[PDB]
Amino acid sequence: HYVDWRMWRDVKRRKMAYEYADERLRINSLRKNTILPKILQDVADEEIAALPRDSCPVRIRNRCVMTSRPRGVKRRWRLSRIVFRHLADHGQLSGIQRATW
Amino acid sequence: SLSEYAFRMSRLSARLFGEVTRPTNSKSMKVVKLFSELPLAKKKETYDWYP
Amino acid sequence: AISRTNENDPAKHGDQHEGQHYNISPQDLETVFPHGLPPRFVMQVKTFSEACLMVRKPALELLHYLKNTSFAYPAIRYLLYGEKGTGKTLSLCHVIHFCAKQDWLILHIPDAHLWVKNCRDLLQSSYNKQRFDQPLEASTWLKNFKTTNERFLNQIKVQEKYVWNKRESTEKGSPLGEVVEQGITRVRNATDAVGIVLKELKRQSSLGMFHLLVAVDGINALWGRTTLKREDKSPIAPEELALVHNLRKMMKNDWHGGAIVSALSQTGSLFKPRKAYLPQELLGKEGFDALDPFIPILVSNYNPKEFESCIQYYLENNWLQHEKAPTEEGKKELLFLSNANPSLLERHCAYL
Amino acid sequence: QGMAFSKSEGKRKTAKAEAIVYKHGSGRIKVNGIDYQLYFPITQDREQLMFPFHFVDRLGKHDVTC
Amino acid sequence: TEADMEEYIWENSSSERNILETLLQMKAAEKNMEINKEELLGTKEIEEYKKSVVSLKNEEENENSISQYKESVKRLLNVT
Amino acid sequence: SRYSPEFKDPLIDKEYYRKPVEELTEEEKYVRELKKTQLIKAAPAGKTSSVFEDPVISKFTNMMMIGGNKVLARSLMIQTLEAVKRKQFEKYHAASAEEQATIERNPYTIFHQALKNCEPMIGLVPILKGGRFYQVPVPLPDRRRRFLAMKWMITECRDKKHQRTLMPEKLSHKLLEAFHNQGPVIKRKHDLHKMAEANRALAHY
Ligand SMILES: Nc1ncnc2c1ncn2[C@@H]1O[C@H](COP(=O)(O)OP(=O)(O)OP(=O)(O)O)[C@@H](O)[C@H]1O
Ligand SMILES: Nc1nc2c(ncn2[C@@H]2O[C@H](COP(=O)(O)OP(=O)(O)O)[C@@H](O)[C@H]2O)c(=O)[nH]1
Ligand SMILES: [Mg+2]
Ligand SMILES: [Mg+2]
Numbered sequence A: 001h002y003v004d005w006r007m008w009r010d011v012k013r014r015k016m017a018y019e020y021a022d023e024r025l026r027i028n029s030l031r032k033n034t035i036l037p038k039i040l041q042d043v044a045d046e047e048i049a050a051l052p053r054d055s056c057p058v059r060i061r062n063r064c065v066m067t068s069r070p071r072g073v074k075r076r077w078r079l080s081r082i083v084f085r086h087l088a089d090h091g092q093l094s095g096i097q098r099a100t101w
Numbered sequence B: 001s002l003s004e005y006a007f008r009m010s011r012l013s014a015r016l017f018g019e020v021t022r023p024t025n026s027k028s029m030k031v032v033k034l035f036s037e038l039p040l041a042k043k044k045e046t047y048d049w050y051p
Numbered sequence C: 001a002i003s004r005t006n007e008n009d010p011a012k013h014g015d016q017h018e019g020q021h022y023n024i025s026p027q028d029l030e031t032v033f034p035h036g037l038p039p040r041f042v043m044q045v046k047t048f049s050e051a052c053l054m055v056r057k058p059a060l061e062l063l064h065y066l067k068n069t070s071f072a073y074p075a076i077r078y079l080l081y082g083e084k085g086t087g088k089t090l091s092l093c094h095v096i097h098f099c100a101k102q103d104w105l106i107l108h109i110p111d112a113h114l115w116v117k118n119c120r121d122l123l124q125s126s127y128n129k130q131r132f133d134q135p136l137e138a139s140t141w142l143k144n145f146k147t148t149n150e151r152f153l154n155q156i157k158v159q160e161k162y163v164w165n166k167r168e169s170t171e172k173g174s175p176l177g178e179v180v181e182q183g184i185t186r187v188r189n190a191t192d193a194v195g196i197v198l199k200e201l202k203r204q205s206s207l208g209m210f211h212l213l214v215a216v217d218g219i220n221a222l223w224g225r226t227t228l229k230r231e232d233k234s235p236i237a238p239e240e241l242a243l244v245h246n247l248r249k250m251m252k253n254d255w256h257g258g259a260i261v262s263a264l265s266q267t268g269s270l271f272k273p274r275k276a277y278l279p280q281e282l283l284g285k286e287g288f289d290a291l292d293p294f295i296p297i298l299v300s301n302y303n304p305k306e307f308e309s310c311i312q313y314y315l316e317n318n319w320l321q322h323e324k325a326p327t328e329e330g331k332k333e334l335l336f337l338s339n340a341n342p343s344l345l346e347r348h349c350a351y352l
Numbered sequence D: 001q002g003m004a005f006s007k008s009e010g011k012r013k014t015a016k017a018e019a020i021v022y023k024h025g026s027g028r029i030k031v032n033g034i035d036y037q038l039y040f041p042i043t044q045d046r047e048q049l050m051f052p053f054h055f056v057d058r059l060g061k062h063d064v065t066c
Numbered sequence E: 001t002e003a004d005m006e007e008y009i010w011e012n013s014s015s016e017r018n019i020l021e022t023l024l025q026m027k028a029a030e031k032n033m034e035i036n037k038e039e040l041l042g043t044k045e046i047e048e049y050k051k052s053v054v055s056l057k058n059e060e061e062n063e064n065s066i067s068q069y070k071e072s073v074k075r076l077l078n079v080t
Numbered sequence F: 001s002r003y004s005p006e007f008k009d010p011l012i013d014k015e016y017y018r019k020p021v022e023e024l025t026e027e028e029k030y031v032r033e034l035k036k037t038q039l040i041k042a043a044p045a046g047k048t049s050s051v052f053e054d055p056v057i058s059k060f061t062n063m064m065m066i067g068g069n070k071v072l073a074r075s076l077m078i079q080t081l082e083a084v085k086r087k088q089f090e091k092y093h094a095a096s097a098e099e100q101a102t103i104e105r106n107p108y109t110i111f112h113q114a115l116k117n118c119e120p121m122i123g124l125v126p127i128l129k130g131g132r133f134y135q136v137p138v139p140l141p142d143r144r145r146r147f148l149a150m151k152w153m154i155t156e157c158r159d160k161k162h163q164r165t166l167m168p169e170k171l172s173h174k175l176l177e178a179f180h181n182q183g184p185v186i187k188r189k190h191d192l193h194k195m196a197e198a199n200r201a202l203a204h205y
Helices: A007-020 A021-031 A038-049 A079-088 B004-016 B030-034 C026-031 C039-048 C056-068 C087-100 C135-148 C174-186 C187-205 C241-248 C278-293 C302-318 C328-338 C342-351 D043-055 E015-028 E044-058 E063-076 F014-018 F026-035 F057-064 F069-095 F109-118 F143-158 F168-180 F184-198
Strands: C022-025 C053-054 C075-080 C105-109 C212-217 C257-262 C292-297 D005-012 D014-021 D028-029 F124-129 F132-139
Touching: A007 A021, A021 A038, A021 B030, C026 C087, C026 C135, C039 C053, C039 C342, C039 F069, C053 C087, C053 C302, C056 C075, C056 C087, C056 C257, C056 C292, C056 F014, C075 C087, C075 C278, C087 C105, C087 C212, C087 C257, C105 C135, C105 C187, C135 C174, C135 C187, C174 C187, C187 C212, C187 C241, C187 F026, C212 C241, C212 F132, C241 F069, C278 E015, C292 E063, C302 C328, C302 C342, C342 F069, D005 E063, D043 F069, E015 E044, E015 E063, E044 E063, F057 F069, F057 F109, F057 F143, F069 F109, F069 F168, F109 F143, F124 F184, F132 F184, F143 F168
Parallel strands: C075 C257, C075 C292, C105 C212, C212 C257
Antiparallel strands: C022 C053, D005 D014, F124 F132
16 A cells, blocks of 8 residues: 555565664674774674665665655655645645745 | 873773773774664664655 | 154164164175065165165164173073064164174074975985985075175184085184085085084184174074975974074073074964964964063054154155155055055055 | 943944944054954955045044944 | 973973073173072062063963063063 | 935045035036935945045956956056056166156056057947948947057956066056057057058948
């Protein structure tokens, strides 16, 4: 019941990224220092590379929550420019108005 | 570039204010940042992005 | 001639001559001032075909101290300070002219900021491998030092043996001119020749041979920062320069038989803001400690009397060509725009 | 001290100034505690300060702290 | 060290060392053998010089402080 | 413009205001009582009541200004006026008592006369006729003649023929040349006039 299959894939990526966040954070800490032995850091490189691809947070895309538009999204409202304007132009977004100056 | 007095006075303030006490390079200071905040994936804006 | 005085002897100037311009003969410009005059003031000498210096209370105060100098006590440090363009350099030159005409030996550094910046050939020193030599800066000064003190460079004789190379050496008793000619002829030895000159003059003035005036304009350069870089693009410190290391010693009051008169300058300084003029702000902590105890003499803008005589000196040379400049309405505008500042007035009058 | 003065304000672009002009003075102008020629090293800025006093023939007759 | 201090202290400073070295050269020039440190640094002239250097070092420098320092140096160096 | 049409330009002239009332005419009396009811624009930063104000030099300075850098443009101007004055003081001291009387040392008089010697009386217009272009001579208004004298002088000094010479030395040298009816800018005036004479038969287009 999500807008499209592409929104559904991002939903799963956000769910899997949330589930692996603690594990990935801990392994990354081992890789992000010059204190531990390289032999130990080389093993940590392999461990985080073996985690599921969709646990990686860089693959999450901020899509419009009502239309799944992948670009032209305003982060504060999580809406595409088109959907935001539709609500704003009907006076349904509190405090938002056309700007003239 | 600090005198012995200044170097030891800065190391004492770090102990009192709960900062890093050992000499640590910038690369290793990322460990402190990593555990001082929530990961992006754990932020509510991220995992509750969609309704 | 309401702005001129007939007294051209700087030893006879007094409070009655304040605001009046005395003439420096062309012979004294060539001998006493081969360097040290402000560049724009040099332009005025070529334009007016004469060099005329106003007698002002900063120089008169300083001339009073020098005339009462006790040559048995350690040398006294005098520091001219003031806002930009107030006349510090030309007050120093008025004092250099007094000592030059009293048969003092003149050690005049016309600008010490030139020794800490824009050095193309910064060679390593041979006498000390931890210091850098400056052949062009050192040879240039040596030529001017020879011109000013040529009559004394034969009577003064070295008191040690100085080795320039394996083959060449200056034996004891050789005229000090020989040390000055080695540095000029061989620029590689110029920085070491300067160090020997400062060494012998400080030594032989304390023995009673002659009176020595140390005149350093831009003294705040010696204890500041440099813009010179090493081959590894690392900053060099002023103490590591042989010229600055040796000049710093002339500024100590560990000798007698003369005086040390210096002037601060923000113009041409390094890492100092435009409006910095006070001694500590320009000298720093290392600089103020090196000169303390010293007698600071303030140089300020023209007083009403000095301003009018300056305008009259310009009008007497036909320098103010605008038909409204001689009027009272024109002089009030020239006073507001300069605010009585000598340098601002000269620049404004330069194009009127 | 009993010295008569007036106070006013001016705006130019994003600059805002508040000036105190004393009835009697010698022509001194202080800008944020600084002499006007040290604060305004550009000759055109000093001409602008001259313009009001010169136009009414009162150069050297008032002190200003702005 | 001195660089760590945030308040200037005249005692055991370069100023105290320089002025004392100067006064000794002056006594030697007069051929006087009263070279006692406590006596040289106990005069009123030294107390004004000490008060002037400290003001220059710990307070904002200005034309009035430089003039107070000037008059203190002239009395110690016998410059009239 | 941020000024409504009601705003009148300011008249910056001390003499205009000190003029006595009796000398005023009935027309000049009306203009003065009218302006008391009118809105006046703020005086621009360019012009003041100063006795040293010269509108011609101020205009030449603006025509030299690059990218709003008035400080640099004015610095070049005053350096040129100083360079002209020093060149004339050098020519004056090196001359005999008789020649000294003819040597001008005022740079404002030289600057004004140098430009007046470059003003072209008549100019040409590129006109099109039958798919072919032929220039037509026409009188020049006073504004255009003064503007062209300043544009030719500035253009000549910006020419790449001058190698590493600073602007105050180039302009001072050209002003003194034109002051003596010599130079490239004077030639440009002569060429424009000579061309406007060869096209006199085309004055009917
Ligand atoms: N005593 C004087 N006699 C004649 N002209 C003077 C005198 N003092 C100042 N002037 C004028 O003011 C100009 C600036 O003087 P001078 O170079 O001595 O100032 P300064 O304070 O040393 O400058 P800076 O702050 O740049 O080091 C001179 O070139 C000269 O035109
Ligand atoms: N070439 C050369 N320079 C000398 C000699 N003696 C002294 N100098 C120079 O004179 C300066 C002053 O001498 P001195 O007081 O011995 O210097 P210091 O040893 O560096 O403190 C030195 O810095 C050298 O530049 C010498 O024998 N040969
Ligand atoms: Mg992305
Ligand atoms: Mg100077």
